[PDB]
Amino acid sequence: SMYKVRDISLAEWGRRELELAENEMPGLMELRREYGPSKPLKGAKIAGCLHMTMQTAVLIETLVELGAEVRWASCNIFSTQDHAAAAIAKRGIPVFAWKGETEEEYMWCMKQTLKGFSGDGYPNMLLDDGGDLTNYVLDECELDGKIYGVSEETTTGVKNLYKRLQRGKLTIPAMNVNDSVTKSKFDNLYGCRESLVDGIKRATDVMIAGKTACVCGYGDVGKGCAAALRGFGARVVVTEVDPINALQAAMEGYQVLLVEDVVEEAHIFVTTTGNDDIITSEHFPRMRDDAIVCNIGHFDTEIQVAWLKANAKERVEVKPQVDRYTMANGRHIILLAEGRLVNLGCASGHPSFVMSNSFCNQVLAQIELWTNRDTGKYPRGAKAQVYFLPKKLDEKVAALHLGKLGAKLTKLTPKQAEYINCPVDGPFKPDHYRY
Amino acid sequence: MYKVRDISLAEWGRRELELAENEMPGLMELRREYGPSKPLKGAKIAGCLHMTMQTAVLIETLVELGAEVRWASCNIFSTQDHAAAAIAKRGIPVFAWKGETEEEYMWCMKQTLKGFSGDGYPNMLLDDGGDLTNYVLDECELDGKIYGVSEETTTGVKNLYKRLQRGKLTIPAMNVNDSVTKSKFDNLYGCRESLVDGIKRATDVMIAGKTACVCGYGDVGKGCAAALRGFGARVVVTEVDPINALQAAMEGYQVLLVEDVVEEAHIFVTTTGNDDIITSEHFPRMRDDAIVCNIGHFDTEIQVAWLKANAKERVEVKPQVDRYTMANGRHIILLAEGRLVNLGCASGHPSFVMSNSFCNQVLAQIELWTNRDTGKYPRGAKAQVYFLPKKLDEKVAALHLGKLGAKLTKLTPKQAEYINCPVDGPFKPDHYRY
Amino acid sequence: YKVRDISLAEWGRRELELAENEMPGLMELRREYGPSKPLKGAKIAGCLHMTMQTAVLIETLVELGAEVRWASCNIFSTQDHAAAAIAKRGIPVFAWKGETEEEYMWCMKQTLKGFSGDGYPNMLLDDGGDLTNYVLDECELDGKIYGVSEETTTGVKNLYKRLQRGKLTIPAMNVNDSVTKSKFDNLYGCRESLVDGIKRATDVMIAGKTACVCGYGDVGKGCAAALRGFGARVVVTEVDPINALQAAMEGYQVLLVEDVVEEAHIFVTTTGNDDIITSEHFPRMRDDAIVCNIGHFDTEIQVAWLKANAKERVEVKPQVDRYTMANGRHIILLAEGRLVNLGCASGHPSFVMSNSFCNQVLAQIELWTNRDTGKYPRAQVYFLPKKLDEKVAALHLGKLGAKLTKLTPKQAEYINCPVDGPFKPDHYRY
Amino acid sequence: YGDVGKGCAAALRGFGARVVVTEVDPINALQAAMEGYQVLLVEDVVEEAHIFVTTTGNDDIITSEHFPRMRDDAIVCNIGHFDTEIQVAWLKANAKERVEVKPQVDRYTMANGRHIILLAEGRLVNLGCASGHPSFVMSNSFCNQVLAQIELWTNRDTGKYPRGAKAQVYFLPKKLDEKVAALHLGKLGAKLTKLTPKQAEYINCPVDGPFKPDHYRY
Ligand SMILES: NC(=O)c1ccc[n+]([C@@H]2O[C@H](COP(=O)([O-])OP(=O)(O)OC[C@H]3O[C@@H](n4cnc5c(N)ncnc54)[C@H](O)[C@@H]3O)[C@@H](O)[C@H]2O)c1
Ligand SMILES: NC(=O)c1ccc[n+]([C@@H]2O[C@H](COP(=O)([O-])OP(=O)(O)OC[C@H]3O[C@@H](n4cnc5c(N)ncnc54)[C@H](O)[C@@H]3O)[C@@H](O)[C@H]2O)c1
Ligand SMILES: NC(=O)c1ccc[n+]([C@@H]2O[C@H](COP(=O)([O-])OP(=O)(O)OC[C@H]3O[C@@H](n4cnc5c(N)ncnc54)[C@H](O)[C@@H]3O)[C@@H](O)[C@H]2O)c1
Ligand SMILES: NC(=O)c1ccc[n+]([C@@H]2O[C@H](COP(=O)([O-])OP(=O)(O)OC[C@H]3O[C@@H](n4cnc5c(N)ncnc54)[C@H](O)[C@@H]3O)[C@@H](O)[C@H]2O)c1
C-alpha cells in the first residue's frame, strides 16, 4: 500500500489548481529555485502529518525537489482536499489521506508514513501539525534513535513540545515553526481573518452583519477571527483568561465578558483557545435557536461535542460537516465540522499566499535540522531541545513575499544602521521584539 | 528649589490632576497597595521624563511610596506648565517649562542630580530617551552612587543595549518600554490617539481624503497609520524591515519609498527612531502646504536645520507651527520644530494608557531599589538590562480591566494543566509576542 | 585476534597483577566509573603501543562499558605476553613484536571493522596520529566518529596542522598536553625508560661517556637528566632559544651535532623532527658510537642511508644492529631508529603510564558522554579541564604516601581559587 | 612547590639537606614526589626541621601552631613577596626575649626556653639578607620589563591595549620571549641549531620562530 486517497481521478483537477497555488506561493517557489540544485534534503526521509490541502501539496513537492523522500498523511479527519491528495498520489508520492476519515482510518494513515522508505524503510525526520505524529513516534514506536528532527507547525503542537520537554520526554530536536514571526503573526492572524468566515459561509451562508458573535480567546487566531467578523458588521464579544490579551481586545473596542454573559443572545460562537471545555453542557441548553457553534483551534474538544450528540433529541446532517441538533427545549444548534477546525473542515483553510510564509519556515526548519544532523548543533539525547528559526531567516521569508504585492523596502545607510544598532542587511530587531 | 513657567497655574493643574487620577486606576491602586509599606523609602530619584499631567500622577505615586524625587522634562516642548506648577506647589522639585532652550534643558536636568537629603545626590534614575542616563554615566561623580535606571522608550532602550555592548553600562537598567503592557499599549494605542490630536490642534487640517506617508511601521507607526486611516486618509508606509513591511502590506497599506510619494503626500509622519528620514532630498519636492511632523523620540528624523537654513521665509503661524516658504515658492508646515508632535502640539497620550506605562515604571523602581543590597541586579562592569517579570506585566493589565468593565474568565485546574500554566498565570511563554 | 603466541597469556596475566598494583589511578577509575558505565555505547578504535600498561588501559575502558579493538602504533613496541593476555580475555588485538610495514597496516584496518551493528567505530584513541590520518583521509566512517583522543606530541602536532588546514572533522582532545601527561610521562617516563632501552640493548656504561641529546623538550629534558644521573657528560642541541637557555642553565653545553659528532659515544634524538642525525654525521662518528631515537618516528635518523651505505651490518641481537662503515669503523643503531625505550625495553614504567592513561580515560568519557550534548561539534582540538588534570595527579599521591595541605577559606580567597581548586590559572606552566 | 619552591628545594638538596615539601596542589605535589622529596604537612616535620622556608605567596603558612613546637635554633625565613606567610607579629608578641644577632637576623627566645632565628623579619630573605638574584638572570626578567613598557607606551593611541571597562591582562608575544632568551645564549657560548625549510614545515612553525604553540609549558 503505497497511497490511499478518495479518488485518483481527481488528480487532473488538483493539478490545474496547483498551478494557481504555485503562483500564489512565491516564497516556496523561490526556495525551490535557490535550494533545488544543491539538494539540501538528499537522504532525508520525512514523514509528514499536516492537513492535505493544495497548499501542503506545494510544500510536499518543494521538499521532494530539495531531495527528500516524503510520505504524508493529514493531521485532521476533515481537512484533506481530495484533489490535492490525488495530484500528489498520481505523481508517485505516498499520501494516505481523504476528507472524512474515521479516527481509526486516521491512525492507519499516519502509520503508513512511518514505513516504506528506501533502504531500511524508516523515516528520519518528522513534519508535524498538532503533535499527534510526534507523540505516536515518541511514545508508541522502533524509531528511538532513528529520528533527527521534527518541525512543528501549530501553537497546540508547540505547547505539547514544551510540556514534553519539561517532563523530560523530548528525545529529538524540535524546530518551533509556529513561533517564527512570519508564521504566528501572519498565518495565525491574517489566515484566520480570511478563512474563518469562508468556513462559516460555505457551511451555512449565514449573514454576519448585525449578528452577535462570541469569540473565545484573543490570541493570534482570535485576533484574526474577531477582526474578520467585525469587518462584516457583526458585534463581536471576546472571552479571555489572560489580562493582557483581554486588555488588547477592550482597547480594540470589543466587550470582554464571560461566555455565560452572552450565551443566551449570541448568534455565533467561535472557539480559538487551544484549550478544552470552552463551550460546554452548561452553555448549549441556553443558546438561542439556530445558534452556530464552531471551533478553529487545533482539537475539537474546545466544544463538548460528545455531550451535544448524547443529549440532543434530534440530529440532521444539513449537508456534510453541517449538523443541526434539536435540543430538549425544542431549539436548534448548528454545529460545524463536528467541532473540527472549521476553516479546513467546511472551506479550504488559509489561502496559498499566507501558507507560503508558514511553509517557507517549514522548509527552512527541515533544512536546518537535516543539514546539521552530524554537527551536534541540534542534539538527539536526553538533552534534546526546542529551537526557533534564526531571525535572519524569518526576515528572508517575509522579503520573499513582498515582491508579489509590489511592496518596496527602504535600504538603511551605513550611518542609519549604526545608529539603530543593526546591520544594513539585518536582522533589524532585537530577539525579544514582538512586532 | 524649582523652576517652572508660572506657579499660579498650580490650581488649574490640581483640577485636571483629579480627572487624571480617576483615569489612572492602576497607578492609584499601586498607591494603595504599596503606600503603607513605603518600598521606596531611602530612594532618591532623578527623573527625566515629559512633565505632563500624567507624569504628575507618576511623580506623586513615587512620593507616596517613600521616594524623594527631583524632576525635569526629556523634551523642550513637552511640558504642560499647569502640571509642573501643581507638582512644584506641593514642594516637589521640578525644573521644567514648555519652550525650553537646549541650554535651559541641560540646566534643568542638572538640577535633578543635586539637592536631595543628606549628601544630596540621587541613587536612582528614571529616564525617557536616555539623555539623563548618558549624562550621569559619561559626564558625572555619581559613579557607584546609582542603584538603577528604568527606561521608558524605544530609543532609550536601544541606547542601553549599545552601551551594554560597548561595555559602558555600569548600572542595572530596567527596560520598561519592552514590557508588553507598555510597548503594545502606549506605543501603539497612545499614538493612535495622540498623533492626530497633535496634528489637529496645530493645523485643523482635514485628514479625510489626504495622502499621508507614515515612515516606519513599528509599534508607533502601526498606531499612527491606524489613526490616519480611521479618519479616511490614504496611508502609505515606508520600512526597512521586511517583516514590518509585510504586516503593513497585509493590513492594506501601500509600502513604498519616501521618493515615490514625496511629490503628492499631504502629510508626512516619521515614526522610526532613526535619523535622516525626511531630508534635503525631499523637502524641495513636497507639495504646497505639505505638513511635516515627527513622533519619534528625537527631532533629527527630519533635517530641520537644513529646512531652516534653506527656506526663503519662515512664519510662526502660532507656537510650534512654522510655515516655511521654499525657493520654489511653495510652503511646508513643520510641527514642533520636528520634536514629538503628540506632546509638542497636543497633550501626549491620554491618562489611561499612561497608567500602564507608569505602573511598569513604578514596579521597575520598586524592583531595583528594594533589591539593591541583594546582588540580584549587579552594579559595575557586569551591569545588565532586565525586563519586568511576566507576572507583573499581567498584573498591570489586570489593574486596568475593571474601569472598562472587562471580565476575565478563570481557568479550571484541568484547563491550566492542559495549557501548561498556573491558574493565576503567567499564561504565556516568555517568547510570546501578543 | 592476531598476536604472536597466545600461550604467553599466562605469563602476561601474572605481570598485569603487578601492573595493576602500580597503576592506582586507572584501578581507581575502574571502581568509580564501572558501576555507572559512562562509555556504554562507546565503540573505541585504539592505536597505541600494545604494552602491559595499555592492557590495564584497555581493560579499564571495557570495565567502563566500551567495546574496544586494538593495534600497536609501532612495529617493535608490542610486548607479546601483553597482547596474549588481552587476546585470551576476549578483546580483539592485532599486535606482535616485529610487524613489517605491511602487517602494521593490516592490524590498524582490523580495528575499524567488526563492532556491533554495521559496527564501525564511533570513537578513536590515538598515539602518533596515524589512525586519525587513516580514518579521516582514507575511510566509510565519515558520519561515524564522535571524537579522537591523542596521546603524543607528534600526533597532536598533526591535529593542529589539520585544524589549521580546515581538515579537522572529528573533535580532538589533546591528551599529551594535559600537565599530568606532558610534565610526567614525557619527562619522568623517559628519565627511566631511555637508559633502560640503551642498557638492555648494549649493556654499555653511561658513566664517563659523552652523550649528545638532540632536542631539549619534555623528552629531551628527561633523557639528559637520566644520562647525567649516571655520570655521562651530556651536550644538547636545540633550535629553540628558550629550551636552549634552560639546558645551558642546567649545566649542559648547548652545541651543534657537528661540534660533538666525532667524540660522542651516544647520540639520542628527542625532537619529533626529521633528519637530525644524517648522512653528513654518520661517517664522522667514533668506533661503536651508539645511535638511537626516542621520538615518535624513526626518521630523525637517516637509517635508510645508513643501511644503503654500510659495508657490513651485523645483528648482535634483535633490535641491536652494528654497522661497519666505509671507514672501517662501526655504528651501533638501536631498534632501527624506532622509539628505543619501547623498542629495546618495556617503555615507561606502569606508575607514570597510569597518569597518561587516566587522562585518556577521562578524555574518552568527556568526548563520548557529550556526544549528544553538542559540546564537541563534529571541529576543534580541546584540552581536558584543569579540574580533571588535578584529579589525575591527586589519584597517584596515596601510593607514594604524599600528603596534600588543605587550603583554609581565607587562604583560597587570598590566592584566588576554590578551596578544592583548580589551584592555578589556565596558562600556568608548572 | 611552584617555580620558587622548585628552585629553593633544588638549592637546599644540592648542598646535602634533606628537603621535605608542602603543597596544596596535587600536580605540584606529585612533581615534588617524583623528584624524590617527601611531601607532607608542616605539622609532620615542625619539631625536627632545622630550616623553614616559605615560598607560597600565601599567608599564614608558619603560625602560632608551629613556632612553639620548633627545635632549638630552627631558622625561619620567607622568600615569597609578602612577609605574612610567617606570623611574625605573633612571634614578636609571644616571645620572651629578642636579640638582634646582626642586622636582619633576630634570635627569639620562646616561653619554652628554646630559640627561633627569624631572617629579615619575614621579608624576602634573598633580597633582605643578601643581594637578591644575580645580574644574569635579572637581565631576562628586566628585558621583558623593557619590552613590556615599549609595547604599552608606543602603542598608546592604537586601541591594541584598550582603556577602562574592557581593560585586560596580556602576556608578551612569544616571539619577544624567544628574543630575550636568544640575547643571553652568547655569553654562555650556547649554539643554536637552525631549522631547514623542510624541518620548520614538518614541525609546523617558521624557520625564525616562534617554535612552540601558545599553550607550551617548557
Ligand atoms: N485553524 C487553523 O488554521 C489554525 C491556525 C493557527 C493556529 N491554530 C490553532 O488555534 C489555536 C489558537 O492558537 P493561537 O496561536 O491563537 O494561540 P494563543 O496562545 O496565541 O491564543 C489562545 C488564547 O486563548 C486564551 N485562553 C486559553 N484558555 C481560555 C479559556 N478557557 N477561555 C478564554 N480564553 C482562553 C489564552 O489566554 C490565549 O490568549 C491553537 O489550537 C492552534 O494550534 C489553528
Ligand atoms: N511620541 C511618543 O509619545 C512616543 C511613544 C512611544 C515611542 N516613541 C518613540 O517613537 C519611536 C518609534 O518607536 P517604536 O516603538 O515604534 O520603534 P520600533 O523599533 O518598533 O519601530 C520603528 C520602525 O522604524 C523602522 N525603520 C528604521 N529606520 C527606518 C528608515 N530609514 N526608513 C523606514 N523605516 C525605518 C524599523 O524597521 C522599525 O520597524 C522611537 O523613537 C521611540 O522612542 C515615542
Ligand atoms: N618514546 C616515548 O615513550 C615518548 C614519550 C613521549 C613523547 N614522545 C615523542 O618524543 C618526541 C618529543 O616529544 P616532546 O614532548 O619532547 O616534544 P617537544 O616539542 O617538547 O620537544 C622537542 C624539541 O626538539 C626541538 N627541536 C626541533 N627540531 C630540532 C632540531 N632539528 N635540532 C635540535 N632540536 C630540535 C624543539 O625546539 C623542541 O624543544 C615527540 O615525537 C613525541 O611524540 C615519545
Ligand atoms: N624572592 C624573590 O626574589 C622572588 C622571585 C620570584 C617570585 N617571588 C615570590 O614568590 C612567591 C611564589 O612565586 P611562584 O612563582 O613560586 O608562585 P607559584 O604559584 O608558582 O607557587 C606557589 C605554590 O604554593 C602553593 N601553595 C599555596 N598555598 C599553599 C599552602 N598554604 N601550603 C603549601 N603550598 C601552598 C601553590 O599551590 C603553588 O604551587 C610569590 O609571592 C612571588 O611574588 C619572589
Q: Could you explain how this protein is built, in words?
A:
In chain A, the strands form two sheets. In chain A, strands 9-8-7-10-11-14-13-12 form an eight-stranded mixed beta sheet, covered by helices on one side. In chain A, strands 3-2-1-4-5-6-15 form a seven-stranded parallel beta sheet, with helices on both faces. The first copy, chain A, has 435 residues and is of the alpha/beta class. Helix content of chain A is 40%, strand content 14%. The first copy, chain A, is globular and about 65 Å long. Chain A folds into two domains: 247 residues, Rossmann fold (3-Layer(aba) Sandwich); 160 residues, Rossmann fold, CATH 3.40.50.720. In chain A, α3 runs parallel beside α14. Chains in contact: A-B, A-C, B-D, C-D. Chains A and B meet through α7, α8, α10, β9 and α15 of A and α7, α8, α10, β9 and α15 of B. One nicotinamide-adenine-dinucleotide sits at the interface of chains B and A. It is classed as hydrolase. Keywords: NAD co-factor complex, Structural Genomics, SGC Stockholm, Structural Genomics Consortium, SGC, Hydrolase, NAD, One-carbon metabolism.
Briefly note the CATH topology name of the largest domain in chain A.
Rossmann fold
Main β sheet profile of chain A = 8 strands, mixed
| Tally of alpha and pi helices of chain A | 16
Query: Which term fits the overall shape of chain A?
Result: globular
Short description:
The structure is cut from a larger assembly and holds four copies of chain A. The first copy, chain A, is an alpha/beta fold and 435 residues long.
